[PDB]
């Protein structure tokens, strides 16, 4: 109730200011590299979704298991980076 009212006010003022300010299909030659930057972002962003629960995962009794799986996930993130790097997926020439 309070959050919605805050959200309404922010965007209603943005529209109000905008109206005052204003009145009162082929293939773009853009490169393959820039596509693979966006797709790299998405896959890394997906692996970041899985790391977000970590501040709560650290309260578990099964710490040995948690820590192994936390580092395992981050290491795969490292290996994903290492693979694009060595396959020249980070070069801009």
């Amino acid at each position: 109730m309070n959050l919605m009212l805050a959200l309404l006010t922010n965007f209603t003022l943005a529209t109000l200011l905008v109206i005052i300010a204003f009145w009162l299909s082929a293939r773009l030659p853009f490169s393959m590299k820039f596509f693979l930057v966006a797709i790299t972002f998405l896959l890394f962003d997906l692996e970041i979704a899985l790391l977000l629960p970590l501040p709560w995962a650290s309260q578990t009794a099964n710490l040995n298991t948690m820590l192994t799986m936390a580092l395992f996930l981050i290491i795969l993130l490292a290996v994903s980076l290492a693979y694009e790097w060595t396959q020249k997926g980070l070069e801009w020439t």
């Binding site: 309070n2 959050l3 009212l5 805050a6 959200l7 006010t9 922010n10 965007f11 003022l13 943005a14 529209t15 200011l17 905008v18 005052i20 300010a21 204003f22 773009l28 853009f30 820039f34 930057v37 966006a38 972002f41 890394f44 962003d45 970041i48 790391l51 977000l52 970590l54 501040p55 709560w56 650290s58 309260q59 710490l63 820590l67 936390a70 580092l71 981050i74 290491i75 993130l77 490292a78 980076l81 790097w85 980070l90 801009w92 020439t93």
Partner: protein, 313 residues
């Protein structure tokens, strides 16, 4: 009383943005052995007002967008989201005390790029769309390190609540245990907000041939984001002790830290040349990200091996 609370957040933000333009011009002026605005009002205090009025009564470009529906949506999304990022900020009390405040700001900030894209499509020009894809590709890249750095710090805080960052730093700023993260965090915000030395849209626009009110609204949104990043950086890394009986003591100290951090973007803009586009991409994918991943590994393990795991509550 809640509507009143919303207004004494929104309006002071826009006044703060208006006068940040003055402060930036004068801080950069003196670092350049000159003065900056000092004629329009005493010490240039009326310069932001003169600029604001000038921009709004300035004839629009009459551009002819390709999508009127989405030409208007871009500035509304930019300015509406910028104001939304302020409602969970504990100064010391948030407007909305969100249990998952950090996720809320991470989630809202992820929507900022939509305004960059939507302006490119609405541009109706091949060159303006290319420029919009380069800005987006830079912004999302530096969102990767911000999310991971943020998570690594929260592993010493134990919560997604922003007020918990104040408790976490009762005895000590988080900059001590995590100054290596603080450095990459600070630079990521410069890159994230497209500030110098990462101001590539301003620069590459200045090169390619082809690429006022609506400009003003976009400008205010960008500068409200600069102030909010620096407020978040102070809360995250330079936590201010909060006294419940004297809450305005926290606000004064917190405001000074935010101003000094905001003035440091100005300081940095005065001091360095501009990165090349491929060079700021190598900075993140080959320098920050490998170090951020390794420190994320470190900060998951560090609380466990020291028995310094924080509570959920």
């Amino acid at each position: 009383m809640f509507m009143i609370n919303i207004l004494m957040l929104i309006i002071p933000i826009l006044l703060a943005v208006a006068f940040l333009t003055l402060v930036e011009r004068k801080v950069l002026g003196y670092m350049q052995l000159r003065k900056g605005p000092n004629v329009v009002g005493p010490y240039g205090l009326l310069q932001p007002i003169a600029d604001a009025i000038k921009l709004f009564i300035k004839e629009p470009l009459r551009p002819a967008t390709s999508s009127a529906s989405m030409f208007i949506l871009a500035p509304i999304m930019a300015l509406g989201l910028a104001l939304t990022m302020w409602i969970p900020l504990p100064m010391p009390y948030p407007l909305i005390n969100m249990n998952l405040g950090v996720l809320f700001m991470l989630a809202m900030s992820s929507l900022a790029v939509y305004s960059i894209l939507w302006s490119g499509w609405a541009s109706n020009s091949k060159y303006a769309l290319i420029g919009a894809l380069r800005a987006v590709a830079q912004t999302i890249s530096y969102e990767v390190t911000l999310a991971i750095i943020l998570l690594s710090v929260l592993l010493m805080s134990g919560s997604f609540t922003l007020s918990t960052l104040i408790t976490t730093q009762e005895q000590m700023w988080l900059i001590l245990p995590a100054w290596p993260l603080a450095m990459m965090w600070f630079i990521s915000t410069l890159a994230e907000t497209n500030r110098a030395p990462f101001d590539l849209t301003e620069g590459e626009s200045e090169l390619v041939s082809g690429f006022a009110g609506p400009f003003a609204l976009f400008f205010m949104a960008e500068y409200a984001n600069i102030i909010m990043m620096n407020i978040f950086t102070a809360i995250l890394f330079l936590g201010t002790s909060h006294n419940p009986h004297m809450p305005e003591l926290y606000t004064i100290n917190f405001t000074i830290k935010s101003l000094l951090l905001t003035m440091s973007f100005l300081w940095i803009r005065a001091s360095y040349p501009r990165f090349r586009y491929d060079q700021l991409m190598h900075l993140l994918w080959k320098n920050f990200l490998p170090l951020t991943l390794a420190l994320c590994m470190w900060h998951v393990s560090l609380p466990i091996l020291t028995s310094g795991i924080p509570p959920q509550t």
